[PDB]
Every structure is written in structure tokens, then in C-alpha cells.
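[SOLVED] Predicted holo structure with fe (iii) ion

Edit: marking solved, answer below. Original request kept for reference. I posted the sequence and ligand SMILES and asked for the 3D complex as C-alpha cells.
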Amino acid sequence: DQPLGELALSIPRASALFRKYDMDYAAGGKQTLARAAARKELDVEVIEAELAKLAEQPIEKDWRSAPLAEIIDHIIVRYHDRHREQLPELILQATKVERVHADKPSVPKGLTKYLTMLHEELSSHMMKEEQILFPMIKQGMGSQAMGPISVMESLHDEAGELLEVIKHTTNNVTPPPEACTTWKAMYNGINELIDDLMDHISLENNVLFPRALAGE
Ligand SMILES: [Fe+3]
């Protein structure tokens, strides 16, 4: 029906269920809903019914037409700053569960290192965005940003690669019945991150970058 990006950016709370399990409306945002419902054996399109259910909600803030400077400032305060505060704690929660519940079978061994790699990668990527690309866009130089953007999108793909590993390491970030408090809450912080981290890349890859390259 509609592109994955515009579907999550028009509907106030589609992004949530529109993520469900294995829905990539971020880096592959311009992909059509038919494709996301093609390779992934989804219902023919009752999704649209799900979309129509919450399509009645009023309009909040359609970033599609918002100024690029507001989009940037929004990402810096809502997503960039958030990740820098979430991942350090997850690294500490991972190394505790990997140590405390090591005797368990379903322990997500290696979770602490994959989280650390994602933390290393992201921090490097955001710093580049905030010091190289975002300032370039605010000055109105978006048309010449093919190089810098094309470089950041490659780093977006490396980030997703790490999310899938973290997903697989945690059995689709789903804890077992033996999960104590420091094991369940952690998986919640992981789900919180993927949400904030999918919407983060969705806004950068489907709105900021194309409009900037479009000279808007
Ligand atoms: Fe970013």
C-alpha cells in the first residue's frame, strides 16, 4: 500500500505494532508495505485494517514537512542522547546476568560484548553525524551530502547487523520463565533501544537525508 517509512511517520502509534517481529521500516524505509508483506509471509494485508484502526487518531507532528534543523535537534535530544544513556547501563546489566545466571541454559552469553560493539559503533557514528553531517545540513549544503550521507547509511547497516545478533543472542529479546528482575528488565531496555533505534534510523534515512539531498 504505502511505504514503510510514511506509514510509521503518519500514524501516531503504528511504529510499535508496525515493528511487531521482523518489520524493517528504518533503513529499508522507502520499501513498500507490499514488499514487507511479500518476502515475510504476512497476511495479504489485514495490516491495513490494523493501520485503519489507529488511523483515526489526530495529527501530532508530521516531521515530513518540519524544518530539517528541528529534525536534527529532535534527534540529538530524543535519540542520540538517549542511546548514550541506555547502552552503558545495558552493558552493566548484561555482565551481571551473564555472571549471575551463567549456570542457566538460556543465558544470553556474549550479550555484553555485542552490546559493547554496538556502543562503540553508535558513539562513533553519532559523533560524525553531529560534527560532520548535521552541521553541513543546517548551513543549507544538503545537496552536496551524497558522500557523507552514503557513508552514514553504510554505518547504519553495520548497526542493524549488530541488532540482529543481539536479537538472536536473546531469543528474539524474549526472556525465559526463570528470568529474575535483572534479566527481564534488561530485555525491556533492549526492546526500548530497538524501538528508539529503529525510529531513529527511520527519521534519518527516510526524511532528513532525502529532503536534505533534495535541497529542501
Ligand atoms: Fe543518527
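OP edit: The CA atoms of residues 85 and 192 lie 12 Å apart. Thanks to everyone who chimed in.
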